[PDB]
Nucleic acid binder design. Structure first.
Lengths: 126, 137, 87, 61, 115, 96
RNA sequence: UAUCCUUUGUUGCCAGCGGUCCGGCCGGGAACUCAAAGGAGACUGCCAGUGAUAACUGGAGGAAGGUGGGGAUGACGUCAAGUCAUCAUGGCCCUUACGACCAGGGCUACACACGUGCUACAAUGGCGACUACAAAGAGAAGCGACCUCGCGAGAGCAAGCGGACCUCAUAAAGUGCGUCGUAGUCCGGAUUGGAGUCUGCAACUCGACUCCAUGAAGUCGGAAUCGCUAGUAAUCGUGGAUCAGAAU
């Protein structure tokens, strides 16, 4: 068995890799069940595709907080870092994609004097 | 099919993928019951009949604005075809959304309506200026 | 050009007793001389008698009456209204 | 009333000396007073702003 | 269907169908239907003839219509005949000012209006 | 086995007293589990620098309350005599 | 605000074992999350094309690249820009008064005309129920658990804390389920009538909220016009600074 945390926005999804069929359990619920009807649910199992696992590995995820998206990206990183423990050599390839990495873009209150707390109020052509 | 995976995004009238696709598949279901054809095939043909080929652009070439015909990229034809189908279905009168789509996808194959009028209008705009054709761009 | 800000004038005498009758509800009609005082909540439901200069007239205070002076509900002069005085 | 302010009377009624309450000195409000100054909560403020009260100062933030 | 003071709640759910009566509303709707045992998801055109009967007799016992409005008029007439400003407020035909209003006040009113 | 939590506002006056309590106990008593920092609860206030205009100012202030552990085990008679007598730190609140 | 690492942890977690009123709660240990400090990292270096070069364009590697995303910050100088009621200051101008105390009457007058704004008309939007996560602050007569009356506000009553141990708090959304698909239909909630609590010495004009009833305009709305590009737009809810107290 191997463990993989996984961070993103404000969600934490622990990943427990266990050699088996290929089914995963998201909060005592199947993958399709939890992430029911969501084109993004696929990106969650992307890291398992590169190194080609899934059909060889069974996972047990435990996420909490944030939204499905943040969870999807959370489980991802968790699975990626979890694959590292199984075989460090996987890093050389898995890393290439960019799964062994979280992400900022953490929502921030729209700063005043601006609009997106990021974009400043442009000026009408000089 | 990705096409349906995309059409379910626009027809996803207000990101409700949960029920959004509920009306989709329900439309293809009643489509096969109303028409003796596969829901898939009867779907693709609906988007093919709604795609422009040559778009005309304005150009104030020194003197005045000149309408010069230009070819359209296969990246915008998909978006437009998809967009004009959901708007047309939302123009019908039947009290069933799943039916407005099924009927729209059917009439789209039969060809006729506003969407077709625009196609002809643009087609008429072309050739009517086949002079600037040497400016194929 | 009325004015009260945060300094209402409630004769310390007709204000201490009106609060005394609040121990358990209200008390029968009372009588006050200084009409300069202003009507307020605590005096709701009670029947204060203002001095018109000759006698004390019963003025049943009401929430809608709050804010106005007791003297405003106590007419000084007395006009018979020489007529069928209807309505 | 001038009658209600019977507190001024050193000798209380039938009740024991404990009968004597307080009563403000400026306004005479028995509700909320301040032993130290003997003034009510509405007088200690008006007297504070005026500065008539020595040693007293408005707390800031 | 017919119930109290001439009401025609047609093509509506048994619930709001009564929420159109100046007397009863939402709260009274759920209570009246729960006491008479009637589905709140049934149209007024699907209600049996025996269900409406048990609905009319129970709703009958209530205060509505003119008899109630007259009580309002009397309540506005009692303080109107007295020397209450509120009563005169309802009229508003009294002086809004500070000069007189009885006469010599056409500079604000304008041409004399009919009595 | 006596735990001594040292808390205060000033960071320096703590290191002085804390180190003292240790050194003095390093002789008579054990070597002590060593004085650690531990988490410090902080309180910050964001008020505009300038009094008029300039809303984007608001400088950052903070009133920290550092803590310590020390913890002296295997206490001896003299181990405490070197504590009750010497006590300099004034802004430090001891808790034995 | 992210990648990673080092230091520390009564925030965290059977990640791992044991107990468990199965609530980390406890034993226990610091991995993880998180808190704090320091440090590591893109520099166009590498590859192809163009060019005198810079550099531009494409590509690989790479967590991110050509100022990765953002704040505070606004020059020689401009408009003789704003402010002498923040303060300082040259000149000028008043001392029974253009000084001071106090009571009362307002700032919330119209036949019309204008500018700037708010309310106006669902079904990712919302509603009904259920349920799972955050950070930063505030509280003495004040924050107000809990109980009782009200489809209520908030009362009557009343515990606790003085506060990283009590309260404001419910985080909203999400998650699971259901309703609906354009019919003025419990959809939408304006307006209005009645009853009524309260903050406040007062709330008719100026209130918040809601019991009770009524319940329109709408089914994406004339001439025009505004903000926005990825977790962003639109949309929903919460906190704080100012502050005795009315903060759309």
């Amino acid at each position: 068995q191997y463990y993989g945390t996984g961070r993103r926005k404000s969600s934490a999804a622990r990943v427990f890799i266990k050699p088996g069929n290929g089914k995963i359990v998201i909060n005592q619920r199947s993958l399709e069940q939890y992430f029911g009807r969501e084109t993004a649910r696929m990106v969650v199992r992307q890291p398992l595709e590169l190194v080609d696992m899934v059909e060889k590995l069974d996972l047990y995820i435990t996420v909490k907080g944030g939204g499905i998206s943040g969870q999807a990206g959370a489980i991802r990183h968790g699975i990626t870092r979890a694959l590292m423990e199984y075989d460090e050599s996987l890093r050389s390839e898995l890393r290439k994609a960019g799964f062994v990495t979280r992400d900022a873009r953490q929502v921030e209150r729209k700063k005043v004097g601006l609009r997106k707390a990021r974009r400043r109020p442009q000026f009408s052509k000089r | 099919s990705e096409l349906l995976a995309k059409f379910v995004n626009i027809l996803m009238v207000d990101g409700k993928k949960s029920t959004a696709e509920s009306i989709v598949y329900s439309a293809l279901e009643t489509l096969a019951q109303r028409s003796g054809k596969s829901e898939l095939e009867a779907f693709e043909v609906a988007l093919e009949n709604v795609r422009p080929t040559v778009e005309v652009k304005s150009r104030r070439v020194g003197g005045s604005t000149y309408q010069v015909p230009v070819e359209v990229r296969p990246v915008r034809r998909n978006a437009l075809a998809m967009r004009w189908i959901v708007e047309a279905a939302r123009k019908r009168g039947d009290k069933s959304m799943a039916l407005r789509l099924a009927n729209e996808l059917s009439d789209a194959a039969e060809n006729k309506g506003t969407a077709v009028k625009k196609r002809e209008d643009v087609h008429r705009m072309a050739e009517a200026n086949k002079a600037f054709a040497h400016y194929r761009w | 050009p009325r004015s009260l800000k945060k300094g209402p004038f409630i004769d310390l005498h007709l204000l201490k007793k009106v609060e005394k009758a609040v121990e358990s509800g209200d008390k029968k009609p009372l009588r006050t001389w200084s009409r300069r005082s202003t009507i307020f909540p605590n005096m709701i439901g009670l029947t204060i008698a203002v001095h018109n200069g000759r006698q004390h007239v019963p003025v049943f205070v009401t929430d809608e009456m709050v804010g106005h002076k007791l003297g405003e509900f106590a007419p000084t002069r007395t006009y018979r209204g020489h007529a069928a005085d209807k309505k | 009333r001038w009658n209600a302010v019977l507190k001024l009377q050193t000798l209380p009624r039938d009740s024991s000396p404990s009968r004597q309450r307080n009563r403000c000195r400026q306004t005479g409000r028995p509700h909320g007073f301040l032993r130290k100054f003997g003034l009510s909560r509405i007088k200690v403020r008006e007297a504070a702003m005026r500065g008539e009260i020595p040693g007293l100062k408005k707390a800031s933030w | 269907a017919r119930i109290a003071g001439i009401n025609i709640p047609d093509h509506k759910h048994a619930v709001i169908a009564l929420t159109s009566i100046y007397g009863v509303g939402k709260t009274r709707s759920k209570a009246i239907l729960a006491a008479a045992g009637i589905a709140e998801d049934v149209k007024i055109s699907e209600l049996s003839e025996g269900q409406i009967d048990t609905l009319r007799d129970e709703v009958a016992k209530f205060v509505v219509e003119g008899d109630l409005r007259r009580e309002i008029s009397m309540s506005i007439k009692r303080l109107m005949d007295l020397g209450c400003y509120r009563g005169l407020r309802h009229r508003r035909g009294l002086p809004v000012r500070g000069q007189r209003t009885k006469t010599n006040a056409r500079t604000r009113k304008g041409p004399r209006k009919p009595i | 086995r006596i735990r001594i939590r040292l808390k205060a506002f000033d960071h320096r006056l703590i290191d002085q007293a804390t180190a003292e309590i240790v050194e003095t106990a390093k002789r008579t008593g054990a070597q002590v589990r060593g004085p650690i920092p531990l988490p410090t609860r902080k309180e910050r206030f964001t008020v505009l620098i300038s009094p008029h205009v300039n809303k984007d100012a608001r400088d950052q202030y903070e009133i920290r309350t550092h803590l310590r552990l020390v913890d002296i085990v295997e206490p001896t008679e003299k181990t405490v005599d070197a504590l009750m007598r010497l006590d300099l730190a004034a802004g430090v609140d001891v808790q034995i």
